Design an enzyme around this catalytic site. Sequence first.
Site, PDB file in Angstrom:
ATOM      1  N   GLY A  18      51.638  47.196  43.988  1.00  0.00           N
ATOM      2  CA  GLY A  18      50.341  47.144  44.310  1.00  0.00           C
ATOM      3  C   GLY A  18      50.377  46.028  45.495  1.00  0.00           C
ATOM      4  N   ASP A 127      41.001  39.077  32.251  1.00  0.00           N
ATOM      5  CA  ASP A 127      41.483  40.504  32.390  1.00  0.00           C
ATOM      6  C   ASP A 127      41.967  40.879  31.424  1.00  0.00           C
ATOM      7  OD1 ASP A 127      41.760  42.473  34.406  1.00  0.00           O
ATOM      8  OD2 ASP A 127      43.360  41.573  35.353  1.00  0.00           O
TER       9      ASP A 127
END
Length: 268
Positions: A18, A127
């Site tokens: 990422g 999250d």
Amino acid sequence: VYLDRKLLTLEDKELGSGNFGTVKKGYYQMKKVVKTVAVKILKPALKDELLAEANVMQQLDNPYIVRMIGICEAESWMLVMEMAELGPLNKYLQQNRHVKDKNIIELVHQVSMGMKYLEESNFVHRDLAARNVLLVTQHYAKISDFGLSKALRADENYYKAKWPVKWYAPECINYYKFSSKSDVWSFGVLMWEAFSYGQKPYRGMKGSEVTAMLEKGERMGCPAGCPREMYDLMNLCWTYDVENRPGFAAVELRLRNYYYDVVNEGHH
Ligand SMILES: Cc1ccc(NC(=O)c2ccc(CN3CCN(C)CC3)cc2)cc1Nc1nccc(-c2cccnc2)n1
């Protein structure tokens, strides 16, 4: 905290990638045994974020939370963690549709145990999603990814702040307030994802449409084959009123008891 680069061996293949960098499998030479590890390797702010993440993991010790081995500053800053070989829960279930409801209950109950601990510890995860639950075995889940996590102030039960909007409680959007109760809302979304074998929530909807849906009191429907008891628990986690929404002690107890009921049914 600080590890010796010479005792760390990294594989060439990556597990994930990422903007922040990559995740790789490796080995770390412990006091005696060698330990398989998952290593988050960074691509000014990013270093501080990783170190903040490490600071949070340092303070946590629970069977259902991923353990940090330590950090290392070498080629890049690295965060070295214990390995959960089966990977993210959502991907696992997508690929293993034969996994039974009882097994899903077991896994989500383990997550509720880790989150009951995190709540007791007064950290907010921020999250909590199926992608951040990692499987050690098909019967052992751990919570991961503490990059957005915050240690609560001694005098408040919330932290006041892109955002994973589809997992966010309405007060996170309306008031920027994150608490263990907002993590319970996210946990309801996580449950939905698990009983949907890793499907993304609110399919086909923009974040802004999800907020509108929720404000009208509307909620995702019950996944195919999902026990009504577990769908009711998702709805309970999706209580709009923060005060009336259960905390993780109540959530964990509901799941614990239902899981025992299903274990009993199986013996019958
Ligand atoms: C065994 C395995 C297989 C794959 C992964 N993958 C990932 O760590 C990962 C990283 C980034 C993304 C971001 N992303 C890009 C690809 N898509 C479309 C999804 C989103 C997704 C997965 C981890 C593991 N195992 C593992 N075990 C222990 C800890 C961790 C771990 C991973 C990440 C952060 N902290 C800890 N990871």
